[PDB]
Amino acid sequence: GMTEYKLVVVGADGVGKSALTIQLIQNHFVDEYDPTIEDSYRKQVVIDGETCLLDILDTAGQEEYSAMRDQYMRTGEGFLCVFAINNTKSFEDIHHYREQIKRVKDSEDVPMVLVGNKCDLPSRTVDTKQAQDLARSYGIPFIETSAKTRQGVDDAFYTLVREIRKHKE
Ligand SMILES: Cc1cccc2cccc(N3CCc4c(nc(OC[C@@H]5CCCN5C)nc4N4[C@@H]5CC[C@H]4CNC5)C3)c12
Ligand SMILES: Nc1nc2c(ncn2[C@@H]2O[C@H](COP(=O)(O)OP(=O)(O)O)[C@@H](O)[C@H]2O)c(=O)[nH]1
Ligand SMILES: [Mg+2]
Numbered sequence: 001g002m003t004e005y006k007l008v009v010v011g012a013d014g015v016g017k018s019a020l021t022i023q024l025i026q027n028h029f030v031d032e033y034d035p036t037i038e039d040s041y042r043k044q045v046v047i048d049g050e051t052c053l054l055d056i057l058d059t060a061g062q063e064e065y066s067a068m069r070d071q072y073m074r075t076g077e078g079f080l081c082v083f084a085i086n087n088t089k090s091f092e093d094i095h096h097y098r099e100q101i102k103r104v105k106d107s108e109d110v111p112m113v114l115v116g117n118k119c120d121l122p123s124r125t126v127d128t129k130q131a132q133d134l135a136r137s138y139g140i141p142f143i144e145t146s147a148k149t150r151q152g153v154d155d156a157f158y159t160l161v162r163e164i165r166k167h168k169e
Contacts, residue, residue: 002044004053005161008076010097012090015082016117019147021058024157029148036060047158054157065100074104078111078164080156083126084118085144091116091126091134098138111163112140115156120146 009017018033025041038060045052057076061069079101083090094114101110114135116126128144135142141159145152 011082119144
């Protein structure tokens with residue numbers, strides 16, 4: 001029938017987590033989506049021939065380490081770690097997010113994809129090589145995306161799904 005996959009999109013404010021989600025769910029580019037709104041969206045898609053129900057959590061709110069957020073977050077089976085290629089700070093923050101995932105899953109190997117969004121922008125302060133290097137040090141895939149032009153968006157989420165399959169073996 002279906003396989004459900006619980007995905008969680010994380011990373012710093014403004015990198016495009018909402019835009020990426022809404023682009024996948026609803027196929028349009030949201031210009032100014034309330035930065036404080038956290039919610040889950042569900043989507044039925046076929047990926048490599050398998051009909052999937054993607055439960056996607058788009059994180060937002062205040063920074064804080066509360067027990068039910070911990071429990072909200074550890075239901076994730078796979079994590080999109082998103083930075084913007086024009087936001088150096090958001091790239092440097094990726095390690096903190098991967099540490100928070102590792103802690104709440106209590107595991108050293110959690111399915112994860114590194115995503116460099118806003119790749120449609122000319123102002124590029126994070127190189128591709130810098131991000132690939134980080135991705136290879138985690139053993140995880142890296143993809144560049146643009147929620148505005150939709151390039152790479154579907155691939156980034158399906159690639160994560162694929163990482164969840166391999167983890168399951
Ligand atoms: C993201 C995440 C993944 C897995 C488990 C988690 C468990 C608890 C909490 C988390 N999350 C909550 C939001 C957040 C978080 N960590 C930051 O780190 C910002 C800077 C970087 C270095 C430390 N810190 C000073 N920021 C968060 N916020 C998001 C993005 C900005 C901020 C406010 N709006 C939404 C942590 C878990
Ligand atoms: N040029 C460009 N702008 C983007 C892209 N993705 C998001 N944005 C814009 O960046 C801002 C923050 O996006 P949002 O999805 O709210 O980021 P979030 O805080 O991670 O949810 C919004 O103004 C978006 O229109 C992109 O791929 N390219
Ligand atoms: Mg948002």
